[PDB]
């Protein structure tokens, strides 16, 4: 384990495997404490500015609850309720916020927006979701995998669907930790090529592996985990059903699922569109872990906050 | 007194008289503690998700203050700010919320919405107001009556106006507790018939009484309390004044009030439309208790929260 | 120092110089405590209702953080989320809020709105900003001046720009404290005449001075501080550039700034419109103190809250 | 007051006047707390590595006591007892120490030695004395002057003797704070010319003044303070008495002292060589404040430590 | 995990693999606590006598800081400052110390000296370094390896240089824990043969392996870790350069390092002689972990102290 | 029991019997607390400057541990590490230390050195050993005697050897407390005559007795305690064995010991020169109490410190 004191969490590519394990180990300790009722108000008096540009259930309340458990206070700052709305620059709001709060979490459209937040703020900035990446989801995701499989190295983790922000994060964290990652998207809907190569260098160094297919049935074979997310809204069923015909073959159902190991984990970052990327029978299936995975957002983010705002100097 | 640990609070019809007295007795103890400055942070580290579909002053801040006094944290979740807005199912948000918070309070349009919340959540769900019922208002209301009259059994409690959600609750709680309830509405604007019969069975068992008139002046005679609420917005002064001509005779003023006992209590759940359901002279009158009644939302809800989230196992 | 227990803070004209110094001395003590890590949860269990009518970054999070540090809880109440939106009177919401919270801060358009809040509420009401005045900004502003110059009496404080709400407050506080205040606006854009005369009587009694010019270059000569704010939006570049041609000569840049003392302080209440009232080179200049000034909103407001809600009886 | 969190304290030239006042204000608060018995264990669990190259009474025990009062622990590390002695590089010991302690104080010969410590350590490094400067002594010194004169600006502070490390610090701090500093040395024994010019720019900006004489009787005229230190050991009474004949006219005695204001302060950083730089009759005189000045090393350094290690992040 | 209450720590050969894992698991828990700011003053009121015969940076301050964090107090006892210096027997000082302190740590020349300390003291005695072994360094070393590789069993750990005290400890701990250890020394400079055979029996039982080469380039092939230390001072470059010509081929540089796995760990117990056993480019290289390894002396020794003095009876 | 608040402890001759019993009673209470694990951090935040001129094991760590147990901090100040070394006067270091610490303990050669310390310091000064006396040893010694014999009055306490500092203290305390003291030295090596007469007046008043023999075998007859110390180093076996031939007949061995009561106590202040003043067989004998006697330095000094620094005003 190593210090993360003062660190931003924008993207996991600038994290070492040991830095990620630090978060996961701390998160497991916090989770056991939570189950046995041991208090841990480690950030008493501290505050987290939460800046939101979009509706949010998971990122919103997992961060807000995490600060409550840790004894501090999260501010829910809809960007529409700030002077950002009326023109104040990002740089200037990061600067003024830095004189009031101890960390900032942003849930933003453009990743450049939270990169600028980190650039100008003198406190840690956490990306709670951007169009480019979803690092706290990946932390939760691999926490869940570690918990259910006892390990991460060499487990076969397969994502099918739109190569988006959480696929990037799934890819990056998986390859830092040595897992065998495979991503299968409709032909023009793949992860950024910068991220694919990051994934490849990561696996090369970690001894894990990345693999980019286009046949979901091919991808999931003997999988330990099958992971999906909502389809590319972009081209919003264009004509009136183009979006469906290209993503629909990538839908996780009892047949697709048939091919993975019997003890496979069904994962989904949520929110899910039932009957689209996934069917009721899979997500509500005994093999689905989406509620445990969602819960781990709280424990992993509590770990992040304590580590970046708690290692104090 | 009996345990309420883990219970939902949707509608008071599924509460016994003793379960309601448990809330009122606990609420009086909390209120005295509050007046003498005795702290009672009994829910330290606990959190309450507050889901709101409508503007709110009383339900919003009485729940938010109650969690602060009890040492925990309420999250103000405008349903527009959640992924409910973008399609996530109620069932799925109740499920994910259950992995983060310790109770949920919903302020919703359709009662079925908070019944579904209760159905799918594994933590207690409290109806902070629905089109069908307003149980926390009734708890506050009969707390106030107990405080001013020293008792509830046999006091004559008269509601005039639109047979709506708070009339239902007024009716149900009153008849569970043995009071003599009478409700007088414009002829097509009466309480649900399911609730009237609930009221009748309740009074039959409690020894109290229910009575559904249509002459407000008739209703209020020798009343201990006269209660009203805003008129049925529905038919929003239709032509340009139909809403008024039918509800206006049911307006609480110095003349209507003339008929009740001299020491009668004027009650109103708020917000009030001055000059409509009630006149300045009555609501600002010495006989009005609307500010004490509004205050008791805080004390009764503090009692509810401590009892449903505090009886822990 | 004197008691401020129970006081409203609407406008500084009804404050004595000693009452203002009480806030500043308390604010400096809190700030040193904050820098050395000494906790001060002096308002545990207390709550602050924050009513907002406009977007806000500084007023919003400086009050919300201040309550967190003091151990209590601020409620963020967008007036659109309250029953104010649906017609409930100000008087009635002040009254009901008074039964739940321990103070109210309002960020409002019409000053009469927060005067009514104070009138009807039985708890202290703090104006967090109105069209008429910005008292908490002035407290922060003169805290900053005291800190950088070691004194306030006789320092020459020059405001250039639109004679608005924060100019009023700058004027009033400055003249209560004995400073030498000068305000320079485009010819029809001057402070209220009620406030100018308040300023004049204040300076007469404090031994400070007020002076209303119309030549910014004239105003700033040998200034200790140069202060500006956003231009009168009113007449929103009317034709397509009238707003600019009249306020633009009042823009703070390296040339205007040239004339003040070399060790002058550049101040701005924020948010700033870079390239309009001020240029990047001045605001980002070594002589600018806008981030220290913004920070002092937290310390001065913490002082206000502890003093008006803490002197308890 | 401003944050000093994480700062090194090598030389006061890189400190603003406000940063120095922050230390002095905090130091006065700590001193009053100490006199009234209010505990302040603000650095519990924290540790300070003290590296010493020379014998020390004042620097040694004022830092060691300061950490005890603050609840943490100072390590007394004679550089002869460390692996520095056996060849380990400064860079490498700063690096390893950084993984164990929370700050480092060094008492060193060559200033470059503590500059390197600061360069390579990731924790704050404090110069407890070097051949070039003695910043903690100057902080104590001007604390004492503020306490006895009520102010620093414009008091006339005169140093006579060898232009050494504490004269540098006396000069720099005095000119940052606006005092009127004059330094009088034997003709080849003056302060570094880098420091004299620093002093001159400082006074130019602060409005104070520096002045370098060579006639002690000239220097001390109407002085508020007369300050001396041990003579340049260098040339250790060379022949057998050269050191004396050049510094001896600069000896502070009842005659030299005659010329200063009657209420002048006699100061000396200690240790003193009685009968050399000063006579028993002056140092033990009612006008001497050397014991109060020495005491203020504890209070000012407690302020430094709490501020650089306490502003934690 | 098993109890270590009351145990001496002289040499790891008398420790089971499970007893070592007990220290490492406890050390990781303490380290996470330290990073998140959770206090753990588990030895309040307890004291550790530290007896030193040689200069020390790492052993000195890691033990002294560890007692501070744990709430107790380490005494720095240079053996020259004790009556040992003047003839008092080891047995008698162990005996008298036993009536005052709760544990003793010795940093000694002759291992027999700390064996006698353990023999006569009735409190635990910890070898902080002897000519024969350096057990606390090995604990730190394999903590670091566990942290960076996720495991110890089967990692290939290669030491090149003088077969000294820390090589012994590296060998013993590695073979207790199942690692694949190889040691390569100049031909007459190998580990004690008692220790080599201990290593061999250990590996036989643990399933790890030991191997004693004399070609560093041979040794390091595909290594997971390459470890070195300072050269045998003995024969202090005898003629004027004999020491160099025999140890210099065993110098860790970019070429030697070339042969190990790319993700190999460079380790060194410190202090290092740059340009001798190791070059700037390796030790300051991204693959070097010497600062993390040095840090783990604090965490592992905190674990030792809490376990041998905390398991109290 | 009486107050000792603020007192110096230089020599026991200026202590009353009741003042000594105050220390012993307090010491027994502290010792029982220590054995049962009852904490007693009575000097939290207080500090003790320990000034040492000689190597020390017992005085060093018994004082340093005593301050740790009491919650404060002892500073180990080797006089070589202070500016005493470089010429600063005793008076001036006592004076400066008085502004930092709360008591001073000195371990010095010349008693005049610690008398001067007491004279100039405004905090209590404790003689931890001087050439003239060893008062804390005597306190421990008679604590031990009280514990083993249940009383002190009338027990026969015999010292054989060099009439030195601890014999003085043995003599003085014994005669204040009513014991029957006899001292037997080689003919020119007797206690100071000032002390012998002090002893005689003391015994005259206490009803105890002093007696100065020169035949050790004569002295020890029917003794309750036999006490010795190291021989006069002075004349360091001059010729090559003169020191031995005169002190050697005064050596405590099984034959000398034969003559005392069977249940006699063998005492020695330590450190011992085995085979000189005492033989292995006596000191390691069941009748020896030197480890219990050494332990009581901690308990008696804890009593002293709490009483002279704790009786605060």
Curated annotation (Swiss-Prot), chains A, B, C, D, E, F:
Extreme thermal stability. It maintains about 50% of its activity after heat treatment for 60 minutes at 100 degrees Celsius. Inhibited by the bisubstrate delta-N-phosphonoacetyl-L-ornithine (PALO). GO terms for biological process: arginine biosynthetic process via ornithine; citrulline biosynthetic process; L-arginine biosynthetic process. This is Ornithine carbamoyltransferase, anabolic. One of its GO terms (cellular component) is cytoplasm. Optimum pH is 6.5 (at 55 degrees Celsius). Reversibly catalyzes the transfer of the carbamoyl group from carbamoyl phosphate (CP) to the N(epsilon) atom of ornithine (ORN) to produce L-citrulline, which is a substrate for argininosuccinate synthetase, the enzyme involved in the final step in arginine biosynthesis. PROSITE patterns: CARBAMOYLTRANSFERASE. Homododecamer (tetramer of trimers). One of its GO terms (molecular function) is amino acid binding. Changing residue 21 to A: Decreased heat stability. It catalyses: carbamoyl phosphate + L-ornithine = L-citrulline + phosphate + H(+). It is found in: Cytoplasm. InterPro entries: Asp/Orn_carbamoyltranf_P-bd (IPR006132), Asp/Orn_carbamoylTrfase (IPR006130), Asp/Orn_carbamoylTrfase_sf (IPR036901), Asp_carbamoyltransf_Asp/Orn-bd (IPR006131), Orn/put_carbamltrans (IPR002292), OTCase_ArgI (IPR024904). Keywords: Amino-acid biosynthesis, Arginine biosynthesis, Cytoplasm, Transferase. Pathway: Amino-acid biosynthesis; L-arginine biosynthesis; L-arginine from L-ornithine and carbamoyl phosphate: step 1/3. The monomer folds into two domains of similar size. The N-terminal domain is the carbamoylphosphate-binding domain; ornithine binds to the C-terminal domain. Belongs to the aspartate/ornithine carbamoyltransferase superfamily. OTCase family. It comes from Pyrococcus furiosus (strain ATCC 43587 / DSM 3638 / JCM 8422 / Vc1). The keyword Flavoprotein does not apply.
């Amino acid at each position: 384990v190593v210090s993360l004191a003062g660190r931003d969490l924008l993207c996991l590519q600038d994290y070492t495997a040991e830095e990620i394990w630090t978060i996961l180990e701390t998160a497991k300790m916090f989770k056991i404490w939570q189950k046995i009722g041991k208090p841990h108000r480690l950030l008493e008096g501290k505050t987290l500015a939460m800046i939101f540009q979009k509706p949010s259930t998971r990122t919103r309340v997992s961060f807000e609850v995490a600060m409550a458990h840790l004894g501090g206070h999260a501010l829910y700052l809809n960007a529409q309720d700030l002077q950002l709305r009326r023109g104040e620059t990002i740089a200037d709001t990061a600067r003024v916020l830095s004189r009031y709060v101890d960390a900032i979490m942003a849930r933003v459209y453009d990743h450049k927006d939270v990169e600028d937040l980190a650039k100008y703020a003198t406190v840690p900035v956490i990306n709670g979701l951007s169009d480019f990446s979803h690092p706290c989801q990946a932390l939760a995701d691999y926490m869940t995998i570690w918990e259910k499989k006892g390990t991460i190295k060499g487990v076969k983790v397969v994502y099918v669907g739109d190569g988006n922000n959480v696929a990037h994060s799934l890819m990056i964290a998986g390859t830092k930790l040595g897992a065998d990652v495979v991503v299968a998207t409709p032909e023009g809907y793949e992860p950024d090529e910068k991220v694919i190569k990051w994934a490849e260098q990561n696996a090369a160094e970690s001894g894990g592996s990345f693999e980019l297919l286009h046949d979901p049935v091919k991808a999931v074979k003997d999988a330990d985990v099958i992971y999906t997310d909502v389809w590319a809204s972009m081209g919003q069923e264009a004509e009136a059903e183009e979006r469906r015909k290209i993503f629909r073959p990538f839908q996780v159902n009892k047949d697709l699922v048939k091919h993975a190991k019997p003890d496979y984990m069904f994962m989904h970052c949520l929110p899910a569109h039932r009957g689209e990327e996934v069917t009721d029978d899979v997500i509500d299936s005994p093999n689905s872990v989406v509620w445990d995975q969602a819960e781990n957002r709280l424990h992993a983010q509590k770990a992040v906050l304590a580590l970046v705002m708690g290692g104090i100097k």
